[PDB]
Amino acid sequence: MEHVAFGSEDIENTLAKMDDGQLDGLAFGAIQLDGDGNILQYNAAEGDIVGRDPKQVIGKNFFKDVAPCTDSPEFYGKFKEGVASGNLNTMFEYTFDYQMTPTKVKVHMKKALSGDSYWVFVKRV
Numbered sequence: 514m515e516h517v518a519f520g521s522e523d524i525e526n527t528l529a530k531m532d533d534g535q536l537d538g539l540a541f542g543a544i545q546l547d548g549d550g551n552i553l554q555y556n557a558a559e560g561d562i563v564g565r566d567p568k569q570v571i572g573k574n575f576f577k578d579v580a581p582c583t584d585s586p587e588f589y590g591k592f593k594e595g596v597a598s599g600n601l602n603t604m605f606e607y608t609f610d611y612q613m614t615p616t617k618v619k620v621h622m623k624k625a626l627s628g629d630s631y632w633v634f635v636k637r638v
């Protein structure tokens with residue numbers, strides 16, 4: 514398992530060294546988005562929580578296509594504000610309930626090392 518805790522202070526730096534297999538080794542879900550919400554990376558742990566296939570979702574828009582229950586001021590809105598300002602580092606609880614059993618999660622949004630991509634981390638609560 515990669516030795517990385519959810520919510521760790523320099524998580525985006527730690528994840529900059531990981532290849533695809535490495536990200537799939539994390540204890541929590543990890544999604545990397547561009548500024549419009551297109552999915553760049555999507556690990557095996559995330560796909561297991563929500564019943565999604567990483568290969569089907571990479572390249573799709575998270576808010577439009579994949580996760581319409583997040584297309585709202587309370588999720589998409591927080592993301593878009595972080596993109597616009599360059600400041601993204603926030604945690605919250607949410608319920609994922611589209612094409613899956615309703616599941617309460619802890620979400621951590623954080624700007625990536627590069628300043629044009631953005632992480633969405635997910636664990637069960």
Ligand SMILES: *C(=O)/C=C/c1ccc(O)cc1
Binds near residue numbers: 560565581611
């Ligand atoms: C609401 O529609 C949530 C859906 C969703 C959340 C997270 C994912 O990785 C995939 C779909």
